[PDB]
Design an enzyme around this catalytic site. Structure first.
Site, mmCIF file in Angstrom:
data_model
loop_
_atom_site.group_PDB
_atom_site.id
_atom_site.type_symbol
_atom_site.label_atom_id
_atom_site.label_comp_id
_atom_site.label_asym_id
_atom_site.label_seq_id
_atom_site.Cartn_x
_atom_site.Cartn_y
_atom_site.Cartn_z
ATOM 1 C CG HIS A 43 -0.332 -0.054 2.490
ATOM 2 N ND1 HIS A 43 0.431 0.970 3.014
ATOM 3 C CD2 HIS A 43 -0.480 -1.071 3.653
ATOM 4 C CE1 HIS A 43 0.786 0.450 4.214
ATOM 5 N NE2 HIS A 43 0.486 -0.904 4.489
ATOM 6 C CG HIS A 46 4.474 -1.370 2.042
ATOM 7 N ND1 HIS A 46 2.783 -1.711 1.898
ATOM 8 C CD2 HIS A 46 4.543 -2.016 3.256
ATOM 9 C CE1 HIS A 46 2.477 -2.715 3.135
ATOM 10 N NE2 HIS A 46 3.628 -2.734 3.831
ATOM 11 C CG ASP A 79 -2.348 -5.428 -6.811
ATOM 12 O OD1 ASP A 79 -2.616 -4.713 -7.885
ATOM 13 O OD2 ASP A 79 -2.309 -4.868 -5.765
ATOM 14 C CG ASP A 80 2.400 -7.231 -3.393
ATOM 15 O OD1 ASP A 80 1.501 -6.142 -3.253
ATOM 16 O OD2 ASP A 80 2.188 -8.184 -2.832
ATOM 17 C CD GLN A 83 0.289 -1.749 -4.986
ATOM 18 O OE1 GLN A 83 0.097 -0.500 -4.635
ATOM 19 N NE2 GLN A 83 0.150 -2.840 -4.407
ATOM 20 C CE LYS A 151 1.065 1.486 10.968
ATOM 21 N NZ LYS A 151 1.167 1.027 12.258
ATOM 22 C CD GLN A 155 10.369 -3.619 11.191
ATOM 23 O OE1 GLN A 155 9.914 -4.720 11.384
ATOM 24 N NE2 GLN A 155 9.985 -2.938 10.439
ATOM 25 C CB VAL A 178 2.311 6.826 4.371
ATOM 26 C CG1 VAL A 178 1.058 7.268 3.389
ATOM 27 C CG2 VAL A 178 3.633 7.144 3.824
ATOM 28 C CB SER A 187 -1.771 -0.664 9.090
ATOM 29 O OG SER A 187 -2.158 -1.958 9.383
ATOM 30 C CB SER A 188 -2.549 -4.795 5.371
ATOM 31 O OG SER A 188 -1.650 -5.162 6.329
ATOM 32 N NE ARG A 189 -1.906 -6.386 12.164
ATOM 33 C CZ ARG A 189 -1.477 -6.749 13.367
ATOM 34 N NH1 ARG A 189 -1.669 -6.247 14.306
ATOM 35 N NH2 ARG A 189 -0.159 -7.385 13.361
HETATM 36 C C1 LIG Z 1 11.083 -5.291 7.618
HETATM 37 C C2 LIG Z 1 10.069 -6.760 7.734
HETATM 38 C C3 LIG Z 1 10.894 -7.828 8.220
HETATM 39 C C4 LIG Z 1 9.956 -7.022 6.122
HETATM 40 C C5 LIG Z 1 8.836 -6.751 8.138
HETATM 41 N N1 LIG Z 1 8.829 -6.899 9.619
HETATM 42 C C6 LIG Z 1 7.945 -5.444 7.859
HETATM 43 O O1 LIG Z 1 8.035 -4.524 8.634
HETATM 44 N N2 LIG Z 1 7.153 -5.749 6.783
HETATM 45 S S1 LIG Z 1 6.027 -4.602 6.493
HETATM 46 O O2 LIG Z 1 5.661 -5.299 4.990
HETATM 47 O O3 LIG Z 1 5.123 -4.913 7.189
HETATM 48 O O4 LIG Z 1 6.562 -3.184 6.114
HETATM 49 C C7 LIG Z 1 7.589 -2.915 5.198
HETATM 50 C C8 LIG Z 1 8.036 -1.643 5.493
HETATM 51 O O5 LIG Z 1 7.137 -0.581 5.256
HETATM 52 C C9 LIG Z 1 6.821 0.274 6.301
HETATM 53 N N3 LIG Z 1 5.528 0.746 6.486
HETATM 54 C C10 LIG Z 1 4.516 0.074 6.674
HETATM 55 N N4 LIG Z 1 3.391 0.839 6.794
HETATM 56 C C11 LIG Z 1 3.856 1.980 6.774
HETATM 57 C C12 LIG Z 1 3.175 3.391 6.808
HETATM 58 N N5 LIG Z 1 1.930 3.588 6.871
HETATM 59 N N6 LIG Z 1 4.034 4.471 6.587
HETATM 60 C C13 LIG Z 1 5.624 4.236 6.773
HETATM 61 N N7 LIG Z 1 6.032 2.971 6.469
HETATM 62 C C14 LIG Z 1 5.324 2.063 6.528
HETATM 63 C C15 LIG Z 1 7.249 -0.626 7.578
HETATM 64 O O6 LIG Z 1 7.570 0.067 8.866
HETATM 65 C C16 LIG Z 1 8.369 -1.599 7.001
HETATM 66 O O7 LIG Z 1 9.723 -0.925 7.239
#
Ligand SMILES: CC(C)(C)[C@@H](N)C(=O)NS(=O)(=O)OC[C@H]1O[C@@H](n2cnc3c(N)ncnc32)[C@H](O)[C@@H]1O
Ligand SMILES: CC(C)(C)[C@@H](N)C(=O)NS(=O)(=O)OC[C@H]1O[C@@H](n2cnc3c(N)ncnc32)[C@H](O)[C@@H]1O
Lengths: 279, 280
Positions: A43, A46, A79-80, A83, A151, A155, A178, A187-189
């Site tokens: 989304h 990412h 789709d990924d 994008q 976000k 981590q 974002v 978030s996908s949630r």
């Molecule tokens: C690192 C890995 C091991 C692959 C895994 N733990 C993971 O986090 N996968 S993930 O698909 O959930 O996120 C990928 C990246 O995208 C960032 N992200 C997500 N939503 C975001 C948002 N709203 N605004 C900004 N940035 C966002 C995350 O912070 C992360 O760094």
């Protein structure tokens, strides 16, 4: 013999040795390799990471898509990849679990004690899985820079710890969160939230931005402002609300900090955090 | 960057210094060889140095560092060490401080697989975590093409192979055969801690192992019994373990490794040998 690489096209590799060969070859040709680790289901949150990586002059962007076993999950590979193409990403790395873990879980990264706090409360092996897989991707791709969203602030900090403690030769770039139009962190949630829950969910970002502005009046004013905002929302079960220094140590008496929240709305767990300047 | 003088010994203390020089050197097409040591160098360490040196176009980096992690006492002779290195034509010694290697104490670390809980790790359950953690740091600072380890510390060698495989590290691990005294005693700094009686009794380790290796035509039981008989004949040798494993230190009539650890007074000695079961 280096694998085929078509510049300006999306090149997809699933074999670690292949992406490793291509990255090395590209680096030798004067490209700066940028790594954007993801779990797919992309989304806009990412893609902000992708966009940040793209603006580095001479960049080639590697986006990994892989779901770690050690750290129910929907996916859409086609789709990924569409994008990523639309963003002009030239490398997607999409390995299998067997390619990433051919000997199973044997050697792993043990994070420091921050890994037991906050998100590590409900999930105490989560960050071990995160740092283990990130280390592995860092060694495969050998990027000049690696991008993480603010976000998942905890981590991000832990990856900074990984990089410093293992003397890794990569710059860690944190990318601002974002948000949807009302401030909810993307978030996908979020899609799982019913109308009532989606409305109450705004309280996390609202609480945090209120705190950030209450902060001129001190640390306790900031915490109380955030708590009042959360207290005005129904069906929002707060797991934690904590103010820490920017490296997630104890908040110093003044200066820069981070306020983090986590909460449950029915079965959906949401997180958010924000920069705070105390006083 | 800092200065590198080819054909001389160049000593760096700052991780940043050796990393910049290593990186520069690798750009020039020279292949970077790493020999991790704790110093107190003897002919056994110099076998790894020589193995590294024979690699065409190699620049040899020897690290000298005593890790406060892998202990839970070690002889330091740093002037001698540098003199030996200079004599071997080694161009880089890396001698970091404890503060430079561990500015945040023990924070992020490597957790080895279950092999690290066994053999040497049985009594010392955090030992290999220390080793793999410091070696990972060294590999990241120096970024060598190849890293050299003695078969003397066979379990350590195996565990380094797992580290490199499991973290996808871009380095070849080269095992170097155990250098022995004229009677077969495996060269170790810990040997100096042996008086003339203990030193004479110490031959039993290699004798027992080499006896086993030849007995092995008659099977694993014969090989183990031969080794044990020799250890039993040996005055004041107390055995901690004597184990026959597969070459990756899993169980077991194929090919394998026989490992021994024994005490002579306060001095703990180790030895190991390649074993072939049913093979003349
Ligand atoms: C690192 C890995 C091991 C692959 C895994 N733990 C993971 O986090 N996968 S993930 O698909 O959930 O996120 C990928 C990246 O995208 C960032 N992200 C997500 N939503 C975001 C948002 N709203 N605004 C900004 N940035 C966002 C995350 O912070 C992360 O760094
Ligand atoms: C790896 C590090 C963290 C620095 C540390 N755990 C360590 O082992 N320090 S050390 O100074 O004792 O040995 C350095 C290397 O020298 C090898 N070695 C010693 N005696 C040898 C011999 N007789 N024949 C062949 N090779 C020999 C060891 O096997 C090791 O690979």
């Amino acid at each position: 013999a280096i694998p085929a690489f078509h510049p300006g096209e999306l090149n997809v590799y699933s074999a670690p040795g292949d992406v490793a060969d291509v990255s090395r070859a590209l680096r030798l040709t004067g490209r700066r390799v940028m790594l954007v680790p993801t779990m797919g289901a992309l989304h806009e949150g990412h893609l902000a990471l992708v966009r940040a990586a793209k603006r580095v002059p001479g960049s080639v962007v590697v986006v990994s898509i892989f779901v770690n076993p050690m750290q129910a999950y929907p996916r859409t590979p086609d789709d990924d990849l569409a994008q990523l193409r639309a963003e002009g990403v030239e490398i997607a790395f999409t390995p299998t679990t067997a390619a990433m873990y051919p000997d199973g879980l044997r050697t792993t990264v043990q994070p420091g004690p921050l890994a037991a706090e906050l998100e590590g409360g409900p999930r105490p092996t989560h960050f071990a899985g995160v740092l283990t897989v990130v280390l592995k991707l860092l060694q495969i791709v050998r990027p000049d820079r690696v991008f993480f969203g603010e976000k998942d602030y905890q981590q991000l900090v832990l990856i900074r710890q990984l990089v410093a403690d293992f003397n890794l030769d990569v710059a860690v770039v944190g990318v601002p969160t974002v948000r949807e139009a009302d401030g909810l962190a993307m978030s996908s949630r979020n899609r799982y939230l019913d109308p009532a829950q989606r409305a109450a969910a705004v309280a996390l970002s609202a609480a945090l931005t209120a705190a950030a502005h209450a902060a001129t009046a001190g640390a306790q004013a900031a915490l109380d402002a955030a708590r009042a905002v959360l207290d005005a929302a129904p069906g929002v079960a707060v797991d934690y609300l904590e103010l820490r220094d920017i490296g997630l140590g104890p908040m110093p008496l003044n200066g820069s900090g981070r306020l983090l929240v986590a909460a449950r709305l029915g079965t959906t767990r949401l997180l958010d955090n924000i920069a705070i300047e105390i006083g």
